[PDB]
Write a protein that binds this ligand. Structure first.
Ligand SMILES: COc1ccc(S(=O)(=O)N2CCN(C)CC2)cc1NC(=O)c1[nH]c(C)c2c1CCCCC2=O
Length: 109
């Protein structure tokens, strides 16, 4: 049994983002070896993705809403830091982040 906010972050926020057309690059960790990105783990000290966030939500890892929001923010900023600002992945990230922020301000008290 989790707090109302955490429940909403899983059943509303994560689930809406997961079903989005641009969720696919964000549903699993970046496999930097398979994708030939030798400096990825050197630049990204804390990889994060929606698949990892989901499991944490489902496992009661998070103490409260803000910790989950922190993970989401890390996922987005990792993408902006690593890629070039015109890359497709970055415009997908921006799109997904605006919806996220949208659903976050809709969060219950
Ligand atoms: C060619 O890309 C892929 C090929 C296959 C796969 S995948 O997991 O094998 N899978 C996705 C789900 N689909 C159903 C099956 C294929 C992922 C990816 N890539 C990503 O995810 C991804 N995500 C980020 C955030 C970045 C990247 C790579 C871009 C630069 C680093 C970067 O920032």
């Amino acid at each position: 049994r989790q707090t109302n906010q955490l429940q909403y972050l899983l059943r509303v926020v994560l689930k809406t983002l997961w079903k989005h057309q641009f969720a696919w690059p964000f549903q699993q960790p970046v496999d930097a070896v398979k994708l030939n990105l030798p400096d990825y783990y050197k630049i990204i000290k804390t990889p994060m993705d929606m698949g990892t966030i989901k499991k944490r939500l489902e496992n009661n890892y998070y103490w409260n809403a803000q910790e989950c929001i922190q993970d989401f923010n890390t996922m987005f900023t990792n993408c902006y830091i690593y890629n070039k600002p015109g890359d497709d992945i970055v415009l997908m990230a921006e799109a997904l982040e605006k919806l996220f922020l949208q659903k976050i301000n809709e969060l219950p008290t």
